[PDB]
A paper describes a structure:
We crystallized ErbB2 ECD in complex with the Fab fragment of an anti-domain I antibody, which helps to stabilize ErbB2 ECD without affecting the dimerization arm in domain II, and solved its structure at 3.1 Å resolution in the space group P1. There are two ErbB2 ECD-Fab complex molecules in one asymmetric unit. The overall architecture of ErbB2 ECD in this complex is very similar to other reported structures of ErbB2 ECD with a root-mean-square deviation (r.m.s.d) of 1.4 Å for the Cα atoms of all residues in the ErbB2 ECD. However, an obvious shift can be observed in the dimerization arms (residues 245 to 266) in the two ErbB2 molecules. Interestingly, the dimerization arm of the ErbB2 protomer B [ErbB2(B)] is well stabilized and accommodated by a C-shaped pocket formed by domains I(A), II(A), and III(A) of the ErbB2 protomer A [ErbB2(A)], suggesting a novel “back to head”dimeric interaction in the ErbB2 homodimer. ErbB2 dimerization was facilitated mostly by interactions between domain II(B) of ErbB2(B) and domains I(A) and III(A) of ErbB2(A). Six residues (Y252 to F257) at the tip of the dimerization arm served as a “hand” to interact with the groove made by domain I(A) and domain III(A). A set of “face to face” parallel hydrophobic π interactions can be observed: the first is between F257 in domain II(B) and H447 in domain III(A), and the second involves the phenol ring of Y252 in domain II(B) and the imidazole ring of H448 in domain III(A). The ErbB2 ECD homodimer structure is not symmetrical like that of the ErbB1 ECD-ligand(s) dimer complex. Upon forming the homodimeric complex, domain II(B) “wedges” into the C-shaped pocket between domains I(A) and III(A), pushes them slightly apart, and then causes a substantial reorientation of domain II(A), which connects domain I(A) and III(A).
Author numbering:
A (entry chain A): 1 to 101, 111 to 564
B (entry chain D), C (entry chain C): 1 to 217
Amino acid sequence: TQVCTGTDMKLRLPASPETHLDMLRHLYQGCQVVQGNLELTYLPTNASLSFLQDIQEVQGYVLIAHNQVRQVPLQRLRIVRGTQLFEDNYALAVLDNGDPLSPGGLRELQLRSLTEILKGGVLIQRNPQLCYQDTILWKDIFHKNNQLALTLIDTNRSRACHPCSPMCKGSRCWGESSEDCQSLTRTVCAGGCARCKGPLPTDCCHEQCAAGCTGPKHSDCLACLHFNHSGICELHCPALVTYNTDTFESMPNPEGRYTFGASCVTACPYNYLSTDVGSCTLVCPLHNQEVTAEDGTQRCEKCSKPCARVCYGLGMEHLREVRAVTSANIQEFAGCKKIFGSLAFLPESFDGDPASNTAPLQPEQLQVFETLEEITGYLYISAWPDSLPDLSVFQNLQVIRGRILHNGAYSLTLQGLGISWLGLRSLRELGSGLALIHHNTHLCFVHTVPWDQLFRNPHQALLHTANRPEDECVGEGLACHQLCARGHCWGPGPTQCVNCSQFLRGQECVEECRVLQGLPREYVNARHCLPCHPECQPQNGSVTCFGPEADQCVA
Amino acid sequence: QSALTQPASVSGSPGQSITISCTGTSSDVGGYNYVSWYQQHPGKAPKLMIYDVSKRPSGVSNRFSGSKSGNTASLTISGLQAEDEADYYCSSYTSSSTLVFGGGTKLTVLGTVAAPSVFIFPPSDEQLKSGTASVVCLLNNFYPREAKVQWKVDNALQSGNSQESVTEQDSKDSTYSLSSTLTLSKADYEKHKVYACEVTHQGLSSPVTKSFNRGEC
Amino acid sequence: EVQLVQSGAEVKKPGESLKISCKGSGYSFTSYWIGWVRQAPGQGLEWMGWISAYNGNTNYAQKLQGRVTMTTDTSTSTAYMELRSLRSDDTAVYYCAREGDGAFDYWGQGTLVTVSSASTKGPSVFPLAPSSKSTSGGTAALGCLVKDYFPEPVTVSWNSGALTSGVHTFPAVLQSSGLYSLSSVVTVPSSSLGTQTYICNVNHKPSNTKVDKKVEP
Ligand SMILES: *[C@H]1O[C@H](CO)[C@@H](O[C@@H]2O[C@H](CO)[C@@H](O)[C@H](O)[C@H]2NC(C)=O)[C@H](O)[C@H]1NC(C)=O
């Protein structure tokens, strides 16, 4: 598309190596800008990375580590912003891309468009076949105002380097090609100006540019240093509302814009909440609370008294340090319809934690979540009590928003479990991110969930492996109850359909309601089947009801 | 295309010491710093010293030190440790992605201007029978690189037939030998009786002679 | 260790095509570039080109263009210089070497490729002889002789190599009869000689005529 979100796995090892690259391809496939962290680790020696090839910006840092591919095709990456930084120092880290037990290893960074690095430094280390890194004039890459220009490059090798291309002026190259010559854009400019495309003052870049320029104007930039608001680079985006100089009453500003990453945006993108000031967020500002229009979206707005308290999940005010959901906190979810944060259930949880005398969580305390219907951050389940065949305690969960993703990528994660089906019946949407369901031996009924319906953005997919094989499910009989419209269920039975192509008596499908026959006697409304009065018509006559009380049941 | 220039020339005196030169254009050494030097002893591969302009592989002697403003190109040897005589080669990288070598220069150290020992040979009653009778002279130990040979085929100053090669400057005692003999098929040997070789080298006390005769014992 | 091992020497007629091989070992073969340089008899080094043993990319000489082709074969760790339409004068030593920073740090042994129009004829083994008639006052000289042969080289060892003392041999020279000659004298005592065994191994593997020729008083 245009923008994608990065990941935040750091150096931690891919739970599903067999889906790991397949993950990456999904996230970055069409992607030109990654709001987040470009993290490429653990990639196996013969591994197509052609999808990486459209990326120009990386809003935070870039981490290439523990790989064996020999190329990582980011020729087009042009500026990193180092919003966030690896080990809090580095906007670009390549570590340990070697061999551990026609050699393996990255041979040339080839970062041949990389002229801008706004914040953070460069750490390159332990890369056996890596050539030309010490050819590079790093201070030309680092921005002027870049506070963190410290740099930590290793040169130990186990192979040797051809010369740079004859076209290399000064022989500094990202690789053996002419294409890889380090373009200089900061140290060679006329006057003190921070970027330029040539030695003449006439070549100096507009002060709002970042990586270079095709010209003198703030329309001629390679990347904006602040905000791209159309063809033009500016320091900030037009405000949302202009005031009346006497009254000081807000007036809707016709040419006003929101800010999303480093762009001046007309309207906030799908899963982000818009805001009073003019910013797009994943978390509201200090003194606000979430709104919703009939228009399906959400906004932040300020509140009437110091705000009505709400449930905070893990990764949040108060639980932001806690790894897992556990007996010591299970109570804190007493009857919440919506959790700001995430829930994760680890081995840690259901096993004890004698390290600080905290008790093993019981399969029945989990029922606190039966009222639960919205999760803003992700759901992550990795242990789960053998007793329970499913995730029914979340059978009223209706949206996982993804605003905070596990390891930067996964809104839904079920792994190493013992469950036999899923039972998230009312789960109609995963707001952002991808599902990873892997290594659950007994898991049937995955195939039935119409996962395409839950997803919102096309960088989204289910990644599954090492589950019970569908063949072994269709075979051993387990399948969608015939009353489940279009064949989609979350498990065995008529309780578990995603849609009912007949009626709904409670949480169950029924081919007909009791308006003709049938004992505890009944009536029909919005495809449902509601009971009539404890004493209305006991008859065998025609259409014997119409309603709940003795108000409307014709006697 | 399109060789760099050096002189074949350096000379110099044991102890220390002089420098070779390269040099070549903006497009080659005057534009690249991939400029390397090689020490070739006779009839061996080249030895690699030194690279990038100024840097030494392991084992390479201190005070091998190339550097300098392009378009040159300047290897330097400093103590003339005795046996450093070799042909010497500069090479550079090129705006055409090509390696290019200089013409080479022959380093050659000084020392005692020594005087030759001159034995006198025939070829053999094995040699004569094929229609060949070469009258022979070697030039054992001396300096510098020219003296005057003058065969004596019964006193005739013949010219042409007086063949010539030259060994490398002797690696332990800084001297030259030199190949001097005589083309003599079985046609041109018979009516001459006395055969002397006079080696008029500036290092002896005067022109010295030592003699072989045709049919003694 | 690091080894670059090349083909045995070659002899080719004008119009034919040469094809030397270079097998590298003990270092990761794909990791480095390999280059080819040649040395025409007693002359300058001449870079021919280089190969990427990782990706197969090649730069060539601009004088050899049309006529060269280098290749590698990863499976067997070998590089293949190939010179077609040989016409003289390509006669040279032909090294292949392992390329560092524009510069070669490990060579092959060499590969004499000889291109002349003429066919193969052997040497002329002759013992020059020394008694007191050949005494320079306490030290002697003697050595066999080599004349009118083809092609190179002509190993002249001395007493199974078990006397590397005073042995002083000459460059082959092209005569007026088209085939080379030289000498091979051993500086040894006329303190000793004859009495001592001065056997010269006058090989000519081009003729395969291993010749033992002992020289005595
Ligand atoms: C910001 O301005 C617009 C975004 O709407 C971008 O215009 C496109 O960007 C590139 C080249 O400029 C190409 O995709 C298109 O040719 C442009 N117009 C389109 C998308 O039709 C522009 O790239 C952005 N500028 C910067 C510096 O980020």
